[PDB]
C-alpha cells in the first residue's frame, strides 16, 4: 500500500509530518514516498506539479497532501502559482468526488459563531462535484463582447456546463453516502435561474429513482446559505456542484468554529483518493511550529478508511484524537480556558500516545 | 421654493398599508416634499391593463426618486405572465436602468435573539451589500440544454449558462459602490472568484482601475467562499461590500438570515446618478394583506435610504433611523417581531410610534 506524501508549503510540512508520525506508529507497514508540490515544486524544478510528482501520485494507492501557497510565491505567473498543483492533481487523477465533513467537537462548541444549541453535535457531510462546472468550462477568457447592449466592449466570460454523466456519477456517490447515514440527501442548485442547474436537478431526480430508501430534497443555493447559518443540523448529506460546493462547504466549516479540525477527501471512480486538511495555507504562522495538525491527521484516518481498507486503523486514529481533546490538549487556534496548549509536534506526540 | 419630487408607488395588498406609514413619516419631517402617487402592479392592471402603466413609468422618470411598496396578490395570479404584478419590478429596473441593488444587513439589539449568531457578533450590525442586478450569469447568453459540443463528454446531454461582464457594467457598479462607501466609513470590499473565473479577474481589474478615482476609500478584495465564511464569523468587520449578481444574491441572503429578522430589511435599486427606487426587501404577503398588521418598518427604513442615497439628505435619514431605534427601545412590535412583554401594534400604530419618536 503505497502513499504519495505531498507536504507542500509553509504549514504543510509541519502538519503532514505529524500525520506521517501517526501513520508510522500504527502496526501496519505502508510504503510512504515524498515529493515536492506547490511552491516547493517550483523551488525544486520550476513547476508547482513537477512531472515526477504527478507520476508518483498516479502510481500510488492514495495521496496524503498538506497545503500549498505562501507569500514568497504569490508573485509567480498565474500558471506556476502553488495553487495550480491542487487543480492539476484533481484533473489529471480524475478525482471528481469531494467529501467535506463539517463536525463541531464537544470541547470546542464555544468557538462557533452560532449559539451553542445550533452546533452541539453537528455532523453533516457536503459532497462537492470537483472536475466540472464553471470552474473548468470552455470557452472562457476576455474578448470583445460579441453581442448585447455592450457589443464591442472588453468583456470577461466563463461557461458554466454540466453533462449527464458528470451529474450522474456525483449523484450516485452522494446517494451512497446518504444510505450509510440518515438516508436524507439535499441537492443544491440554482434551478430557478440557471439552465445548468435545472439540468442538474433533472438528472438528480432521475438518479433518485434508484434509491427509494433515501429522501431527496432540493434547495436553491441562496436559501442553502441561509439555512446552514440558521440551523445546520437540519441536514445530513448535501450534494452540489463545484462552485456552489466550494462556497457552502467553506461556510459550513466556519460555522463549526474550528477549521483546523476538518479534513477533505477527493476520490476517483475506484475510491483512490487525495486526502488533505480542508483549511488551506496559513502564511501568518507558517514554519513557527504552532499550526493545528488535527485536520491533517484526521485526513490520514479518512485515507485509511476510504482508500486502503483499513477502517480499524482509521477508528484508532479517530479515537486517539477524541482522547487528546478530552485530555485537554489544544493548539493555539482551538485553545480553551485551562487547556494544555501545545505546538504542532507536541500535539502529534499526544495523538501517538493515545493510539 | 424648489421641492424634491418622490414618485410613490404603493402596489397591492400590504403595499399601500406600509407605504402609507412611510409617507406619514416623510410628511412629519420639517421639509416639504412633492409626493405624487401612481398605481403599480395589480392596481396598475385595474386602472390601465398593465402592471406598469405608461403614466406610472413617466412619473417614475420625472421624479427625483421612487418609493415603492409591494406588488402581487392571489387575485392577480391568473393573469397571463406578462401582465402579472411582479412584472412591474422588472419593468422599472429595465426602463430606469437601475443596476445597483443596495441590500443593507442591519440587526437591532432588541431583536437580536432572532439571529442564529451569538449576540455580540451581530447586535447593532449595519453593513451594506451592493449587488450588481442587471447582468452576470443570471442573464448571460448563450444558455440552455444541448449535446455537448466538445470536451471529454462531447455528444452527451449538457446544460449550460454563460457568465459574462463587460467593462461598462463593472465600471458603473464600482462607481456607485465607491460613492456609497464615501457616505459611510470609506471602506469597500470587492468580492469575486478571481483565482478561478476569468469574469472575476476582469471584474477585479476594472474595480482597481475605478479605485484610482476614490483615493479616500480603502479598497480590498476577497474571494466569495472566504466572504461566506467571514459574514458568518464576524459580519461587523465590513462596511460596504460590492459583488456580482449571483455572488451578491447568495451573500446578501446569507447576511439577511444572520440578522435574524429578514422582514425588517430595506432595499433599493439605483442608477448611475444614484437616483433610486426604494422598497422593503420582503415583497408581497397575501396572507395578511389588508389586515392592518404588516410591519411597516422596512418600508420606513427604505424612505430613510431614499433621503440619504438619492436626495443628499443624510441628516433627515438619520432622524428617521433614530426614530425606528427608539420605538424598538420603547417596546413597540408588530406581530412578526413580537417579543415577551412588548407593546403589540398594527401597521398604523407602528407608524404613529415612529412619527412620535422623530
Ligand atoms: Mg474554498
Ligand atoms: Mg436570493
From Swiss-Prot, chain A:
GO terms, biological process: L-leucine biosynthetic process
Binding site for Mg(2+): 222, 246, 250
Site (Important for catalysis): 135, 190
Catalytic activity: (2R,3S)-3-isopropylmalate + NAD(+) = 4-methyl-2-oxopentanoate + CO2 + NADH
Primary location: cytoplasm
GO CC term (a single one): cytosol
Metabolic or biological pathway, per its Swiss-Prot or TrEMBL entry: Amino-acid biosynthesis; L-leucine biosynthesis; L-leucine from 3-methyl-2-oxobutanoate: step 3/4
Requisite cofactors: Mg(2+); Mn(2+)
Enzyme Commission number: 1.1.1.85
Subcellular location: Cytoplasm
Keyword annotations of the record: Amino-acid biosynthesis, Branched-chain amino acid biosynthesis, Cytoplasm, Leucine biosynthesis, Magnesium, Manganese, Metal-binding, NAD, Oxidoreductase
Gene Ontology molecular functions: 3-isopropylmalate dehydrogenase activity; magnesium ion binding; NAD binding
Cofactor notes: Binds 1 Mg(2+) or Mn(2+) ion per subunit.
SMART domains named in the record: Iso_dh
Residue sites binding NAD(+) per the record: 280-292
Residues that, per the record, bind substrate: 90, 100, 128, 222
Subunit structure: Homodimer.
Function: Catalyzes the oxidation of 3-carboxy-2-hydroxy-4-methylpentanoate (3-isopropylmalate) to 3-carboxy-4-methyl-2-oxopentanoate. The product decarboxylates to 4-methyl-2 oxopentanoate.
Family in the record: Belongs to the isocitrate and isopropylmalate dehydrogenases family. LeuB type 1 subfamily.
Protein name: 3-isopropylmalate dehydrogenase
Organism: Burkholderia thailandensis (strain ATCC 700388 / DSM 13276 / CCUG 48851 / CIP 106301 / E264)
Organism taxonomic ancestry: Bacteria, Pseudomonadati, Pseudomonadota, Betaproteobacteria, Burkholderiales
Amino acid at each position: 500500500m503505497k502513499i504519495a506524501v505531498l507536504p507542500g508549503d509553509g504549514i504543510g510540512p509541519e502538519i503532514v509530518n505529524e500525520a506521517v508520525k501517526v501513520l508510522n506508529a500504527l502496526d501496519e507497514k505502508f510504503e510512504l514516498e515524498h515529493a515536492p508540490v506547490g511552491g516547493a515544486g517550483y523551488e525544486a524544478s520550476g513547476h508547482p506539479l513537477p512531472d515526477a510528482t504527478l507520476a508518483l501520485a498516479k502510481e500510488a494507492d492514495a495521496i496524503l497532501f498538506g497545503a500549498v501557497g505562501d507569500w514568497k510565491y504569490d508573485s509567480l505567473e498565474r500558471a506556476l502559482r502553488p495553487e495550480q498543483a491542487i487543480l492539476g492533481l484533481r484533473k489529471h487523477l480524475e478525482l471528481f468526488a469531494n467529501f467535506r465533513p463539517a463536525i463541531c467537537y464537544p470541547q470546542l462548541v464555544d468557538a462557533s459563531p452560532l449559539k451553542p444549541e445550533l452546533v452541539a453535535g453537528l455532523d453533516i457531510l457536503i459532497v462537492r462535484e470537483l472536475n466540472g462546472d464553471i470552474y473548468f468550462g470552455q470557452p472562457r477568457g476576455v474578448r470583445a463582447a460579441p453581442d448585447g447592449p455592450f457589443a464591442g466592449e472588453r468583456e470577461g466570460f466563463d461557461t458554466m456546463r454540466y453533462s449527464e454523466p458528470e451529474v450522474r456519477r456525483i449523484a450516485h456517490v452522494a446517494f451512497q453516502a446518504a444510505q450509510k447515514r440518515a438516508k436524507k440527501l439535499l441537492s443544491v442548485d440554482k434551478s430557478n435561474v440557471l439552465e445548468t442547474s435545472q439540468f442538474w436537478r433533472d438528472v438528480m431526480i432521475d438518479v433518485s429513482k434508484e434509491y427509494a430508501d433515501v429522501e431527496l430534497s432540493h434547495m436553491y443555493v441562496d436559501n442553502a446559505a441561509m439555512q446552514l447559518a440558521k440551523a445546520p443540523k437540519q441536514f445530513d448529506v448535501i450534494v452540489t456542484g463545484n462552485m456552489f460546493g466550494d462556497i457552502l462547504s467553506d461556510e459550513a466549516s466556519m460555522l463549526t468554529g474550528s477549521i483546523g479540525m476538518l479534513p477533505s477527501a477527493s476520490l476517483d471512480k475506484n475510491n483512490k483518493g487525495l486526502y488533505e486538511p480542508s483549511h488551506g495555507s496559513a502564511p501568518d504562522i507558517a514554519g513557527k511550529g504552532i499550526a493545528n495538525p488535527l485536520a491533517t491527521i484526521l485526513s490520514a484516518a479518512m485515507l485509511l478508511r476510504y482508500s486502503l481498507n483499513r477502517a480499524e486503523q482509521a477508528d484508532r486514529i479517530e479515537r486517539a484524537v477524541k482522547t487528546v481533546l478530552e485530555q485537554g490538549y489544544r493548539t493555539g487556534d482551538i485553545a480553551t480556558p485551562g487547556c494544555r496548549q501545545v505546538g504542532t509536534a507536541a500535539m502529534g506526540d499526544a495523538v501517538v500516545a493515545a493510539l
